[PDB]
Amino acid sequence: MSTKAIYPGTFDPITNGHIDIVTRAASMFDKVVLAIAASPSKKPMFSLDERIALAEQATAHLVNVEVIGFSDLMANFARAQQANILIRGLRAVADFEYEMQLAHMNRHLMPTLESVFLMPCKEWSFISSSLVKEVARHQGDVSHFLPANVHQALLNKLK
Amino acid sequence: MSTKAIYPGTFDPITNGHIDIVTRAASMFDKVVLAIAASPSKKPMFSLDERIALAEQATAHLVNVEVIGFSDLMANFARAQQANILIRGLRAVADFEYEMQLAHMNRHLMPTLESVFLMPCKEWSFISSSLVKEVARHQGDVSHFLPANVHQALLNKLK
């Protein structure tokens, strides 16, 4: 009943793994905002506008998904968006501790916000989006891991 | 716009941690079945009928939650119940690998079934049916961890 979720991340760039997560989120909640962090601590390969553009194209086929940049705490953005659900992808064990921490902090910041964890398809279990960049930087075939539009934009960035 | 989840487990017995998980599940999905495994491999302290009774009482305040026994694979029961969502409590990093395995198997058995992972409230982050029972078996105060009705039943089982 009127479920609204945010799916925050850097999405530098968005990968088939992300698409899978947001697709499955969009299948179980009424609305999903794919929230792109504006000022990440790490210098991203793509600008906020570029990242939004690529994500938009890659998720245009999802009716109930909307891309939006944000610069605040993901907890504050969720409050502004009147989201009661926070989507987090769970790839590996190492990340689990951090994700527990973040959920407990987010509970502290906004107790009505519910963190929800999804695992990726086996296909995308071992892709990193930093391993994808790194492989691409040193001239490898990453076509299987990215949406066509994203792959093109990445090829251009390495010239 | 329609969501039906199962939350499978042995629930021998149901704890505050379980109640917390199913409560949060019930807040974000239209219907939630608290599915109690009939014949766990291990011999449970309480019978299926007892485990149903205690869980019923302890979830009677949740309108859209229904307790049901099952004896098949959780993936088949989900198919029977027309569940598209499977709730898993994800407390320990140790259990994460197993949970990843299970979701991959459950995706094999029923591809339309979406595994969803929730982390407990900090308060219940360290409790298990097993450690509660063990403490209680050697005469310790477990009142904080169990619904009153469950606590009473457990005291009687050990006296």
How far is it, in rounded angstroms, from Cα A139 to Cα A133? 10
**Which residues of A carry a binding-site annotation for ATP?**
10-11, 18, 89-91, 99, 124-130
Touching check for A29 and chain B: CB below 8 Å?
A: yes
How far is it, in rounded angstroms, from Cα A93 to Cα B66? 33
Kindly report the nearest CA distance between residue B5 and chain A, in angstroms: 10
By C-alpha distance, the chain B residue nearest A85 is: B28
The residue type of B89 is G
Kindly report the nearest CA distance between residue A42 and chain B, in angstroms: 27
Classify the C-alpha dihedral A97-A99-A102-A106 as positive or negative. negative
Which of A104, A116, A121 lies nearest to residue B122, judging by beta carbons? A104
Locus of tokens 């063990």: B134
Locus of tokens 């140790």: B94
A58-62 contact pairs (CB < 8 A, 24+): A58/A14, A58/A19, A58/A147, A58/A149, A58/A150, A59/A14, A59/A19, A59/A22, A59/A34, A62/A22, A62/A23, A62/A26, A62/A32
- Method used to obtain the model: X-ray
Catalytic residues of B: 18, 42, 91, 129
| CB neighbour class for A112 (10 Å; exposed up to 12, middle 13-18, buried from 19) | exposed
How far is it, in rounded angstroms, from Cα B128 to Cα B11? 10
Output the CA angle A130-A133-A134, nearest 5 degrees: 85
- Backbone φ and ψ for A129, nearest 5 degrees, come out as 70, -5
Residue of B4, B86, B93 to mutate when probing chain A, most A C-beta within 10 A = B93
Touching check for B119 and chain A: CB below 8 Å?
A: yes
Q: What is the 3-state secondary structure (H, E, C) of chain A?
A: CCCEEECCECCCCCCHHHHHHHHHHHCCCCEEEEEEECCCCCCCCCCHHHHHHHHHHHHCCCCCEEEEEECCCHHHHHHHCCCCEEEEECCCCHHHHHHHHHHHHHHHHCCCCEEEEECCCHHHCCCCCCHHHHHHHCCCCCHHHCCHHHHHHHHHHCC
Resolution, given in Å to one decimal, reads 2.6
How far is it, in rounded angstroms, from Cα A121 to Cα A4? 23
What ranges make up the beta strands (E) of chain B? Answer: 4-9, 31-37, 65-70, 85-89, 114-118
Query: For residues A129 and A12, is the Cβ–Cβ distance under 8 A?
Result: yes
B129 SS3 class: helix
The single residue of A4, A24, A79, A91 carrying the catalytic annotation is A91
Touching check for B105 and chain A: CB below 8 Å?
A: no
Q: Do the Cβ atoms of A28 and B97 come within 8 Å?
A: no
How far is it, in rounded angstroms, from Cα B118 to Cα A44? 30
